[PDB]
Amino acid sequence: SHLDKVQPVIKNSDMSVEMQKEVEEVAKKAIDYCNTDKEIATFIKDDFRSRYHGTWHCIVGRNFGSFVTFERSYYIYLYVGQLAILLFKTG
Amino acid sequence: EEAIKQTLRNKFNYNTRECQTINPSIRERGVSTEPPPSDTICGNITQWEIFD
Structure with a gap:
């Protein structure tokens, strides 16, 4: 029932609704698999890099802020509990 | 009349110069960045x- 409790929320999602839905599952799967925050960042990047190729940069934490240059239609910013999974691909 | 024509074309009435231009030799090279x-x-x- 923990997957129903976390209920991951997506403030800013400059991405297609299909690719967004995939991130929610990976985001939930990442946290319940991982023992620390450093491991969460590593699992997300590696999983997306395999699915969609290129140069991802993943950041997650309690309190931060983020001005970045990204491949247009490859940027999502979702917060779950107190963890903001921020992933973005660059050229 | 044929000989007279050949007789009309002299060495000091039709010099015969050779001229070429300086052409660089072609060369095929590879550059991987x-x-x-x-x-x-x-x-x-x-x-x-x-x-x-």
Whole structure:
């Protein structure tokens, strides 16, 4: 029932609704698999890099802020509990 | 009349110069440009590690 409790929320999602839905599952799967925050960042990047190729940069934490240059239609910013999974691909 | 024509074309009434232009020799070369290697870095920052 923990997957129903976390209920991951997506403030800013400059991405297609299909690719967004995939991130929610990976985001939930990442946290319940991982023992620390450093491991969460590593699992997300590696999983997306395999699915969609290129140069991802993943950041997650309690309190931060983020001005970045990204491949247009490859940027999502979702917060779950107190963890903001921020992933973005660059050229 | 044929000989007279050949007799009309002289050495001092029809000089015969040679002229060419200086042409550089063609040459086929390869150049592969590969950008700097890009290394993954993983850093975590907590309030204590900053203060420490």
